[PDB]
Every structure is written in C-alpha cells, then in structure tokens.
Design a protein around this nucleic acid. Structure first.
Ligand code: NMN
Ligand code: NMN
Ligand code: MG
Ligand code: MG
Ligand code: MG
Ligand code: MG
Ligand code: MG
Ligand code: MG
Ligand code: MG
Ligand code: MG
Ligand code: MG
Ligand code: MG
Ligand code: MG
Ligand code: MG
Ligand code: MG
Ligand code: MG
Ligand code: MG
Ligand code: MG
Lengths: 91, 94, 95, 97, 92
RNA sequence: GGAGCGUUACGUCCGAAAGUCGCAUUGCACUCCGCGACACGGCUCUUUAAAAACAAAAGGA
RNA sequence: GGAGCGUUACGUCCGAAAGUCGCAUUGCACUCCGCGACACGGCUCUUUAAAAACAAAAGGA
C-alpha cells in the first residue's frame, strides 16, 4: 500500500513456466534499477504472482507505476507494493 | 398481379446466342400471334438471357404467353410473363 | 454332401460373417499363403455369399494341402469348413 | 501527365528462378504472399511462355497493391522479384495456354 | 552467441515438413549456402526449424534481416542456435 | 411447413455413399445389389429448381 | 520382467512425464506439494541400443 523495496505483481499468465517468467520479468524490469531477486511460485496460493525485489525503493516505485497495466504474455500486469519487507531486505 | 400488358417479358433464354440472331428467332415463333412493334434484347449484365416483345395489341401478347410458355428454345425452356411497367422496361435497356 | 473332387479353388464356409471384407480377405491370405501361389481370394457379403470365400491356387496340390491342413482351423472363433469348388474359377478356365 | 498504372487483383511476377519445379514455386509463393490477404489461385506453367513467371490472384485488389508495393524486388531463390499488376483476364489466358 | 546455425520458431505448424524446408530455402538462400534445413513435426520440433549456413557471417545477416519476417501468415523469431548437442536432442 | 443448397472435423472423400445396432441367413461365386433402424448449424427460394455463400458444439470412411 | 522399435484408422502427421491437455484458482509470499486424465496389437534384443519389419478391437490433431 505504502512504498517498499519489493513490488507485488499479479494477474500474470499462469501458463508460463517458472524460469521463462523470471527471465521475461527481468528483461522488462531491469531498466528500473538493480534486481536482487524475483520470486515465482506455481503453487495454488502463489500462481499468477511474482515478487520483484529491487535494491533501492526508488527503483521499485519508478517500476510500479510506470509498468502498471503493461501487457505481458497477453495479460495486463497489476502492480502494488508488497505488504511486508522481503526476507533478504529485512535481514 | 402483373396486369395484362401488350409487352411480354421473357427470360431463361440462352445467353450465348447473339442479340440479333436471338431477335429474329424470337420474331418467327411470336409473329403468329400479332404484329410485333419491337423486340428488345441486349446482353448487358441485366438484359442477357432475357427479352421484351412488343405487339400492337394486348390480345396478341396474352395469347403468346399461354401458347409459348416453356417452349424449348435453343435447348432451354422459355419463361414468359407480362412486362410490369413501361419503366422497368426502359430501366432494363439503360 | 461335400465336394471332394480336387480343384484349383477351395470353397470355405462357416466363416464369421461379422468380419469386414478386406480384413477377412487378407487374414485368409496370411494363413493360406504357405501352401502356394494364390491367384485370387473372392469375398462377398451379399445375402447368399456371406460367411464364405473362394481361395484360388495356381496348383491343385496347393489346394489339396491347404484344404487338408486347414480343415476345422478356428478362425474368428468359427472353425473353417473347407471343400473344393464345385466348378473351376474363371481365372483358371482361361488357362 | 503520366498515367497511374491500373490496379488488378492479380499481380504479374517475373525474374523468378527458372530452375525451380513449378509446383514447389507455387507453394513457396503462397508462403510469402498469403499475408497480404486471401489468394484465390497461383498460376505457373512449364510452357516457354511462363518461363520464370507467375500470377498471384488475390480476392481484394487492395491486397495485390500491398503485395506489389511491399515485395517489389524481394530476393526469392536468390533472385529479386519484379512485380507488376496484370493487365486483363485475356492476357493471363494467353500466357497460360 | 553467434553461430553457424539459426533457430527459427513461431512457424506455422499446419504445413508439411517437405514444403516448409523448400519454402525456408527460397527465403534464406540469399544469405549463404545452406548446408541443411532441419524440420520436424514432432511435439518437440513442431513450429521450429534449424538452418545451417556454411559461414557464421550468413547466419548473422539472416537473423537480423529476416527477423519477424511474415511467412505463412506468421512472423518468425530467428534466434541463434544452441549447441550441436542441443540440436541433436531436439530431433528424434 | 415444403423444396433447393453437401460448404465445413487434421483435412480430403462421402452424406442416394458409408459405418453401427437389430433381425434374418450355413449359403458354390467369379460385375453389383436381404430387411429394419440410428446425425448435421445455416443460407436461399416458395409446389419451383434455380441462385451463392457457409458451420465440427452434427454422421460415416 | 527390461530396454529399443511410432509402422498402421479415409490416410497423412503425431504419439515428449524436468511433459501435455482438462478443470479449479486473482491468490501477499520468501516457498516441495489444488484436482483430474495421459490409449496401443506386435517385433527385436536381453541392462545392449542396435536392427529390420508391423496392427484401428488402441490415444490425438
Ligand atoms: N449447407 C449445405 O450446402 C447443405 C446441403 C445439404 C444438406 N445440408 C445439411 O444437411 C441437413 C439435411 O439436409 P436437407 O434437410 O437439405 O436434406 C440440413 O439440416 C443441413 O444441415 C447442408
Ligand atoms: N511398432 C513400433 O514401432 C512401436 C514403437 C513404439 C511404440 N509402439 C506402441 O506403443 C506402445 C507403448 O510403447 P513403449 O512400451 O515403447 O512405451 C507399445 O506397446 C506399442 O504398442 C510401437
Ligand atoms: Mg512478452
Ligand atoms: Mg484372429
Ligand atoms: Mg480445419
Ligand atoms: Mg470438401
Ligand atoms: Mg438431397
Ligand atoms: Mg436445414
Ligand atoms: Mg449416421
Ligand atoms: Mg473407406
Ligand atoms: Mg518374458
Ligand atoms: Mg509416427
Ligand atoms: Mg480421404
Ligand atoms: Mg487403409
Ligand atoms: Mg497432476
Ligand atoms: Mg513383419
Ligand atoms: Mg498385428
Ligand atoms: Mg491439429
């Protein structure tokens, strides 16, 4: 809701495989700043969702609302801030 | 409907026969009903395969209808009927 | 009853009528080929010809050996009944 | 003025590689020309008339204009295509006899 | 990783192997001597092909020049082919 | 309602063919041919037989 | 038993389990993990992966 190092993306094409998605997401979000990591899981609870962990918050914000709705594998991205800090960031 | 007119409208004619040949072939088989004033033929898109026959009298035409309906003509069976309007006619011959 | 006079052509019946023509015609060729050159196999599902086939051999000895070796052989759950053809097949009389 | 060439739903292609069997040539032509719109037929012949040449008959005349403009000089079997609108139906029937 | 061989995908899959090869030659011969075109319609190769050029020069020009080129109504991706080992595994 | 249209499944050929389930049949042929039954969206036209498009969620090889 | 063989339906192509369909699921983690399906006669060899052949009563498009 409130800014954070890590952006929460959902409404993602659930049929892309974990590895292709990460690299696709990397290509289009790396222009915004350094990506620490992208978490992807094809869980029931976690499919269609990604967490991109930026090094700097400013990179996250700039990415969040400039890529909002970006068409990606034929579905518009919905991007919001993660409600908690990612583990790597709060350690 | 289609009120008796001295002009008859004919179609299902073969379209390969030349205008002028078709014209006098029609003249021969239709003169035995009355004195033709004119026969209107053309192979435009909308007059090919069809013709108008104009006698002096309406009796001539009403008789050529019934006598010559289905008549085999260059291997096709003629389809005759009365002209609808002296307008439709002038509108087929552009 | 049966036709015992040797002929180039054997007449099988008691065949399974549910079998399709060219499966039967080719299953027959698979089980009879080893007796000699087969000139033709004739199958017909018509009313009076279903259930039954003619296998034409080049040599009467093939036919005899085929008739004798295969009598009663179980075939699509029916044992073939085999006899000789009452008359020659046309392919034959030419020659 | 110089007159604008009259469009046609059929395009005349030449400077084609004559070493290609005519039935492959059609199929390869369909591969690069179906994007511009529906093809109704492709005309090739082994007669000396049609040597190195073909006609691609489109449904819509707009499609032949896009294909003529987009694929002019396109290299095809290592030989650049020369494309023009076909003239008449009677012209095609002559070279296809 | 520039290489003798290009890997084409997003190819129309409702086309027969023999024709696909001959059509891919008609459009790629311009760039160099094609040593072979590898097509197959297996679940693993369908919609894809390998084109092998004598020289790496030719695969580079082909990859850039023919990128997205519309072909059987579909625009092709041309990527560089991986290793000979990867290729032999995709054919079967 | 009735006719005409057989275009369409991967994508061809059929749809007056075929296949399938019944019922009959133990039968000697060389060209076929027992009986019964079991699909199809749409578009024309209006007792006529033409016109020109067209479906795999509907049948068979 | 186990490997290799994908030839076959009208008759072409296919017949990938680190995979593929189908159904569910819009879900805030830092993590294995929703549910349901994936047919096939036979040949050949015997932990080798070669070699020639081959079925629609068995799966697709
Ligand atoms: N579309 C056509 O050209 C065409 C022609 C004949 C039959 N059919 C189909 O066959 C079915 C039975 O045809 P009829 O009702 O014309 O005998 C129709 O309902 C129609 O679906 C279609
Ligand atoms: N005849 C062949 O060349 C061939 C090859 C592969 C599979 N098959 C069929 O596929 C089935 C499954 O085969 P596998 O036992 O090789 O998985 C076999 O039982 C066989 O029916 C046949
Ligand atoms: Mg993308
Ligand atoms: Mg058996
Ligand atoms: Mg189709
Ligand atoms: Mg058809
Ligand atoms: Mg009918
Ligand atoms: Mg209907
Ligand atoms: Mg049926
Ligand atoms: Mg059949
Ligand atoms: Mg054993
Ligand atoms: Mg196969
Ligand atoms: Mg067929
Ligand atoms: Mg067959
Ligand atoms: Mg599962
Ligand atoms: Mg064998
Ligand atoms: Mg078998
Ligand atoms: Mg398919």
């Amino acid at each position: 809701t409130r800014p954070n190092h890590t952006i929460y993306i959902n409404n993602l094409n659930e049929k892309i495989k974990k590895d292709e998605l990460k690299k696709s997401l990397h290509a289009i979000f790396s222009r915004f700043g350094q990506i620490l990591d992208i978490l992807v899981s094809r869980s029931l609870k976690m499919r269609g969702q990604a967490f991109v962990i930026f090094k700097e918050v400013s990179s996250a914000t700039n990415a969040l609302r400039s890529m909002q709705g970006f068409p990606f594998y034929d579905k518009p991205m919905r991007i919001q801030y993660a409600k908690t800090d990612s583990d790597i960031i709060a350690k």
